[PDB]
């Protein structure tokens, strides 16, 4: 019997200051946060319809730099899909993506974990990471790539919905 | 790729005056039709969410007594699920059910066609068909039975949603 | 910041066979379950709007007779509000109500636990519990009383929504 | 040109105790009010979809017996459609309907005011007004008749939605 | 009597590669398609609310590279309104709008067909068609102009909704 | 007892041509108005959900330059919250903001009126008001600042929703 909507546990990861919180708050509250208030751990929920199916998104917004490592392992084990976020004006955040992806694969003991690569801050003019380099990286992982802006909303719904679609593909 | 909601083609059949139209209009318009205006053929649409899936119901309301028999065969071939309606104060309408069911199975060349047995007018005091007799008939067919009232709305959404659930079970 | 809708943890309690599951399934699925399948423990969820506020209902459907008593204490501690259900044609289930209420107050160590008294099966003709006696019982507890039918849907939404309203009053 | 949904100003009238408030509260809150708390004047709002059109219902719940008569005239002038409610177990409330209808036509200075006749408390066994008599009365006025119960919800949405449909028919003539 | 929502048959036309499919998929899926997969003929549906009226959009996505087909004329004649799409960085696509407008008038056998002029890819730096030139063209036809980006979503809902508004104006 | 959704009376003010109407029509109709049709006074409504609470926005779109002054005073008294709009390519419109805020405070006889500063036309290239100057101004007033574009929709929902959030904060003090 149907016991209520499907829930998806989504985790947003990436380096400090890339816009993990701003992405999530834009999704939930339709609000752009201009301030930089570093996150420890915050959880949000939103019911949405994707490809005709109602679902409840449970979104965990993580800290760029996780001090205690057992807490990080716990959210990686609980997460069903991951947004791996870098900022298109921060080359170091892009170089860090490989580390986040390896950490997730290690903790979940899986090679095929639903993930989407997200290049955020696409509204800003001083781009240091080229679209082609990110697309190549995503292709090498077999995952989608989406450019976003938490300020203009470009790609925000698409990033989260794409991740749900990746989870659903993996569940069949 | 998703191109739009799933559509379900539902056909409402049964003897003259059992409340086929009244059931459908209660579903679509939240309106009870007190008048008895015999139907020739009418089609209705409604988008609903059932078990978290969005769907488009295409509902064909049929005549109690079909003049052209080729037109009847055509809607039987086209329909994916059937509500077989009798009135709980009309014994003849209940005895007629087996004819509608045989016609449908013949045309579809199948013993497992999605169907729901509907005992309508359950608000009226003059009952001549017992719940147990209808339940036994439905059990013999392997289909659900639901008592309805187009006037009180008892069972109306449930009849249609149950039929969609029967179609989905058959498709998988 | 708002992190998504408010969640309410609702627990449905009462004697065996009074319609705990049937009420919950009518709420969630718009479906009347005619079969009597005794419950061990089932959980359901639904998003609804009550008094203009969006909320997520988490509903725990319990067994009439709880064997292991630590498991019962655990759901009573976790529940924020309780529907105490009897059947209007079952005097014993009505006389039992005070036991359920005492068990809840004992475990929660409180005299002011959000609760609603529910008299189910109000569609049936064989009534043995008078509405006035139920209202008097509810008045003695300081809680609302609602007559319901899981078959007709009378009062079903009202029972759950009223319970949410009781929870909100207690939280403020 | 479109400035937001269409608004319909609905007024609920009828004798004391027929269930005007209970109908409205069932519509708005999905709650049956068992208590009898006499109304002075209350206003409620709900956004609904009727025949594919989104609309905002502004509903004025009136007192059975109106003290100040200028205030009654004011809501009758402002109202676009009226639910005229009686209780099916209260013959006197049914006999009163013609007075409410006449008062509305007088104030609005019109013979063609959108209205629906509502026979409430249809869940109760003690019926004293026959459906044939109510149907005849409604036919004589050229308006719909609907039996309702604020307790079971029978006919509640239908009464209000039917009234909106009557208003729309009148606006298109 | 109301039998369910109004349906509008929309057709999206324009030169190869202008973003007809990308616009439609952004509408339906909230997804930007980066790949260029040439279309032959694809159909989508979506229920939306426009000016307070619920409607069902039936959307036909066409080929931009297609020699003369009787089969093309046949599907175009089902259209009630047309999005005529060019890319703001492709002057030839803008000059081709005259050909699509003549094709539509020919197939519909009418001078007054609901249409909207859509200038897509407004996010790109390589603009060759100025806003004022497109506005002047649209004014000459007596139709609206909307600038869009299937990547940012600028103007996507507005293009389709505007077309529905044009259809409604024509029907009254 | 709940009688239907809460209504918020929002007023959009600012110099002529800054995009007051364009913002409102983007919110209501999802439509970008490219034409410049100067407003006299128009009212719009929209039901929205903000922070899980359903509400009805009643939005008054005002004229840049209000000729008869009693009509302006009346909407300022009635309004619960104000969007103060300038265009990021029009320095004069930004210099006007302080005066619109003072006019609102004078009419309402209060120092603490819910308001949001809106910098519109952020899609256009010829910016003359820098983000930092607007943020500083907003900070000096203790109000939020949001950059918007009625063309791209950037910030449109956020401006209106933020204003409702400011009204709710003020009602809870
Ligand atoms: N222009 C622009 N600024 C952005 C965007 N996303 C985030 N920002 C800004 O970048 C800063 C950091 O954003 P924030 O959400 O807090 O980043 P975070 O990744 O959650 N940081 P942490 O790891 O400390 O929790 C903030 O000043 C924010 O406004 C964007 O897409 N565009
Ligand atoms: N009391 C009550 N009356 C009902 C109910 N359903 C239908 N009726 C009434 O029964 C009569 C016949 O209803 P109708 O829907 O037209 O029947 P039908 O099966 O569509 N007739 P046909 O086959 O000629 O199209 C109408 O007067 C209607 O008001 C019900 O559930 N309860
Ligand atoms: N007529 C009618 N029958 C009802 C209603 N509610 C429940 N029933 C019936 O009463 C029986 C028991 O219902 P059920 O929901 O299983 O009760 P329960 O309280 O969950 N049983 P348990 O404690 O064993 O889990 C079933 O046959 C069901 O159809 C009602 O409102 N009216
Ligand atoms: N059984 C049943 N009782 C009803 C129904 N509608 C109203 N009642 C009851 O009848 C009483 C009067 O209802 P109420 O809504 O206050 O009537 P009213 O017409 O608003 N009275 P007034 O004009 O004084 O404001 C209440 O006790 C209420 O529970 C109904 O449909 N069925
Ligand atoms: N940057 C940008 N690229 C776009 C935009 N719309 C479409 N594209 C890109 O342009 C290419 C062609 O788009 P597509 O939608 O397939 O074009 P079409 O008009 O459907 N082509 P056909 O007629 O062959 O079906 C794709 O690579 C797509 O990503 C847009 O608004 N901006
Ligand atoms: N590019 C761009 N143009 C805009 C934007 N907002 C408004 N405009 C344009 O600026 C002009 C004025 O907008 P309008 O909404 O009428 O301004 P207003 O503040 O309501 N004027 P008034 O005070 O006379 O009523 C219009 O041509 C409109 O298209 C925007 O965000 N971006
Ligand atoms: O709810 C929280 N975290 C608990 C878990 C961890 O992993 C999760 C992974 C994905 C989504 C939700 C998760 O929820 C939380 C922290 C701070 C506030 O809420
Ligand atoms: O719609 C109609 N017929 C076409 C077909 C028939 O079978 C169907 C079966 C189920 C649902 C729709 C159907 O539509 C129709 C004739 C008269 C009024 O509507
Ligand atoms: O859901 C479950 N338990 C977790 C908790 C306990 O207390 C609850 C109290 C109220 C509502 C839900 C509850 O859910 C559960 C076990 C087995 C099936 O569902
Ligand atoms: O709301 C009130 N009156 C003002 C007007 C009158 O006519 C109306 C007609 C229909 C809907 C609302 C109306 O509102 C009111 C007084 C007391 C409580 O509410
Ligand atoms: O609606 C109007 N005025 C009445 C009032 C005034 O202040 C208001 C402030 C905010 C929202 C609605 C208001 O509406 C109106 C005149 C012209 C067009 O609409
Ligand atoms: Mg953060
Ligand atoms: Mg019929
Ligand atoms: Mg049970
Ligand atoms: Mg009252
Ligand atoms: Mg294509
Ligand atoms: Mg204006």
Numbering used by the authors:
A (entry chain D), B (entry chain C), C (entry chain F), E (entry chain A): -3 to 168
D (entry chain E), F (entry chain B): -3 to 169
The authors write:
Abd-2 has a benzodioxane bicyclic core with furanyl amide as the right-hand side of the molecule. We also confirmed that Abd-2 reproduced preferential binding to the activated form of KRASG12V-GppNHp compared with the form KRAS-GDP and no longer binds to KRASG12V-GppNHp in the presence of anti-RAS scFv. The electron density is stronger around the benzodioxane core, with the furanyl amide substituent less well defined. No H-bond interactions were observed between the compound and protein, with only van der Waals contacts with K5, L6, V7, E37, D38, S39, D54, I55, L56, G70, Y71 and T74. The electron density around furanyl amide provides an orientation marker for the binding pose of this compound and also the explanation of the competitive effect of anti-RAS antibody fragment on its binding (see below). Superimposing the complexes shows that the CDR2 region of the VH is oriented towards the binding pocket, where benzodioxane interacts with the side chain of K56 in CDR2, partly overlapping with the furanyl substituent. Structure analysis shows that intracellular antibody does not cause structural changes in HRASG12V(3) and the compound-binding pocket remains accessible. Therefore the competition occurs by displacement rather than allosteric changes in RAS protein. The lowest-affinity compounds, Abd-2 and Abd-4, show no effect on cell viability even at the highest doses (these compounds also do not show activity in the RAS biosensor BRET assay).
Here, we employ the intracellular antibody to identify a compound from a chemical fragment library that binds to RAS proteins adjacent to the effector binding region. High-resolution crystal structures show the binding of this compound to mutant RAS, and this structural information facilitates hit to lead development. Our structure-based approach has produced compounds that bind to mutant KRAS with sub-μM affinity that interfere with RAS-effector PPI and endogenous RAS-dependent signalling in human cancer cells, and show a correlation between in vitro binding and potency in the cells. Although, various RAS inhibitors have been described in literature,24–32,47,48, in this paper we describe an approach for the development of RAS-effector inhibitors by combining different elements i.e. (i) the hit identification via a method of intracellular antibody fragment competition; (ii) structure-based design via crystal structures (KRASQ61HGPPNHP) and NMR (waterLOGSY and CPMG); (iii) identification of clear structure-activity relationship (SAR) for the development of potent compounds against KRAS and (iv) the proof of concept in mechanistic and phenotypic cell assays.
